[PDB]
Design an enzyme around this catalytic site. Structure first.
Site, short mmCIF file in Angstrom:
data_model
loop_
_atom_site.label_atom_id
_atom_site.label_comp_id
_atom_site.label_asym_id
_atom_site.label_seq_id
_atom_site.Cartn_x
_atom_site.Cartn_y
_atom_site.Cartn_z
N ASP A 156 0.97 -1.66 -0.03
CA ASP A 156 -0.21 -0.07 0.19
C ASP A 156 0.83 1.07 0.11
O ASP A 156 0.90 2.26 0.69
CB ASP A 156 -1.16 -0.01 0.93
CG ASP A 156 -2.72 0.62 0.41
OD1 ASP A 156 -2.50 1.17 0.17
OD2 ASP A 156 -2.81 0.75 1.43
N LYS A 158 1.70 4.99 -1.04
CA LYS A 158 1.76 5.71 -1.64
C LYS A 158 1.74 7.35 -0.77
O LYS A 158 2.26 6.71 0.63
CB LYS A 158 -0.52 5.97 -1.76
CG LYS A 158 -1.25 5.72 -0.69
CD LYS A 158 -2.35 4.64 -1.24
CE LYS A 158 -3.26 5.00 0.16
NZ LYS A 158 -4.64 5.18 -0.54
N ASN A 161 0.36 7.39 3.32
CA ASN A 161 0.63 6.51 4.52
C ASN A 161 2.25 7.01 4.87
O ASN A 161 2.86 5.60 5.85
CB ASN A 161 0.35 5.25 3.62
CG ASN A 161 -1.09 4.45 3.57
OD1 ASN A 161 -2.09 4.92 4.16
ND2 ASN A 161 -0.95 3.19 2.93
N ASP A 174 -0.79 1.62 7.98
CA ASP A 174 -1.74 2.05 7.59
C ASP A 174 -1.29 0.12 7.02
O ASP A 174 -0.48 0.24 5.45
CB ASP A 174 -1.97 2.58 5.71
CG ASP A 174 -3.46 1.63 5.47
OD1 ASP A 174 -3.73 0.44 5.84
OD2 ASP A 174 -4.07 1.89 4.93
N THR A 191 -3.90 1.68 -4.50
CA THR A 191 -4.32 2.35 -5.13
C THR A 191 -3.72 2.02 -6.65
O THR A 191 -2.71 1.57 -7.18
CB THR A 191 -3.69 3.66 -4.69
OG1 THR A 191 -5.32 5.09 -5.18
CG2 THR A 191 -3.13 4.28 -5.19
#
Ligand SMILES: CCNC(=O)NC[C@H]1COCc2nc3cc(F)ccc3n21
Ligand SMILES: CCNC(=O)NC[C@H]1COCc2nc3cc(F)ccc3n21
Ligand SMILES: CCNC(=O)NC[C@H]1COCc2nc3cc(F)ccc3n21
Length: 340
Positions: A156, A158, A161, A174, A191
């Site tokens: 995850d 990005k 985060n 996260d 995402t």
């Protein structure tokens, strides 16, 4: 890696496995905390600033509604997230301090990082200089070296985060998609702008997807927008799988070369996933000025120190509708979350 790094990672794996095999459970309760403010929200959960009543310490409490977790088919991901977070330990990972559940919700009480998300700071300034992007990238490289050595895929990455701490260092938060995987895995998650081609193409994929996402992050930090930007997901996915990328002319030649090797559509040719593993990244000329030990030891002066008044200041996070946290008098989904 030198032997001292090999020995560090061997110890790190021993310590992870001991906690992984015997997870902590039920180490706080909701009425030990005061509710202060909502820091962020989502489809099945919410992150709240809280204050522990007896100590006065502030924390970020992530609250997940069990019934919504079940309905959105996130049970296994939610159990992964808590089991991994209670077992890891690294300078650039947000710490899990407590966890517990009640009739309605699951709770993960994390350290509170008052500097805000990288995303906000990036959008406000436009783009980061290469040295500034490199400082953050180096911390992600070390963090992925750590996680991958434990057989964990993060999935995850990005800018939302990556939280910025008082010293200007990143702490990754996260773990909702993180998973222990010793070979391949198959779930569609992440995402859109950050998905590797092998995720979009529904293949069995491995830790190489995290190195792809690092290429997208470095590009976005240094350009101010992501490399496969388009208005709708299907168009983003078409660009990702295409094998082409356009670089701004202001990118250095070394940055372009590193990014072409991270953003390699063929996962068997992607930096981070070759015979030399992470060392192809760490030894790349774009990182020539990086002192990896000094970064790990937090001895490098950061490029940017967030402005905030104290450990309870929420100014670097934005404002959300304040909704209450209800706890039913009847237990919901007890069986599904037994191990939490
Ligand atoms: C108006 C302020 N209310 C509270 O301070 N309430 C404390 C406890 C018990 O009441 C429901 C509740 N919801 C919470 C959410 C949190 F993030 C932290 C503590 C929370 N509590
Ligand atoms: C949009 N995406 C995000 O906002 N992702 C970060 C979220 C979810 O991951 C754990 C977490 N901890 C936080 C602490 C905060 F103060 C603010 C937001 C926080 N998040
Ligand atoms: C005690 N610790 C050491 O003596 N050395 C470990 C630190 C500092 O040195 C460079 C370095 N690279 C790393 C990569 C990792 F994945 C994890 C830790 C790493 N370290």
């Amino acid at each position: 890696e030198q032997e001292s790094v090999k020995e560090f990672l061997a110890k790190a794996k021993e310590e992870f496995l001991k906690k992984w095999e015997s997870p902590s459970q039920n180490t706080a309760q909701l009425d030990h905390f005061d509710r202060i403010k909502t820091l962020g929200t989502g489809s099945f959960g919410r992150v709240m600033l809280v204050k522990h009543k007896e100590t006065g310490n502030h924390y970020a409490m992530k609250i997940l509604d069990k019934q919504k977790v079940v309905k959105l088919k996130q049970i296994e991901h939610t159990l992964n997230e808590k089991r991994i977070l209670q077992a890891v330990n690294f300078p650039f990972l947000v710490k899990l301090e407590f966890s517990f559940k009640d009739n309605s919700n699951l709770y993960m009480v994390m350290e509170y990082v008052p500097g805000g998300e990288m995303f906000s700071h990036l959008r406000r300034i436009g783009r980061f200089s290469e040295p500034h992007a490199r400082f953050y990238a180096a911390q992600i490289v070390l963090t992925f070296e750590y996680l991958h050595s434990l057989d964990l895929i993060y999935r995850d990455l990005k800018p939302e985060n990556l939280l910025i701490d008082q010293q200007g260092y990143i702490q990754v938060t996260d773990f909702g998609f993180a998973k222990r995987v010793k070979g391949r895995t198959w779930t569609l998650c992440g995402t859109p702008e950050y998905l590797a081609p092998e995720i979009i193409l529904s293949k069995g994929y491995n830790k190489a997807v995290d190195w792809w996402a690092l290429g997208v992050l470095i590009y976005e930090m240094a350009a101010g927008y992501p490399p496969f930007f388009a208005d709708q997901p299907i168009q983003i996915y078409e660009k990702i799988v295409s094998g082409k990328v356009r670089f701004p002319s202001h990118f250095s030649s070394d940055l372009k070369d590193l990014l072409r090797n991270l953003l390699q559509v063929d996962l068997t040719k992607r930096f981070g996933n070759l015979k030399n593993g992470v060392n192809d990244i760490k030894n790349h000329k774009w990182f020539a000025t990086t002192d990896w030990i000094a970064i790990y030891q937090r001895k490098v002066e950061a490029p940017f120190i967030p402005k905030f008044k104290g450990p309870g200041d929420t100014s670097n996070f934005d404002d959300y509708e304040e909704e209450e946290i209800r706890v039913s008098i009847n237990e919901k989904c007890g069986k599904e979350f037994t191990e939490f």
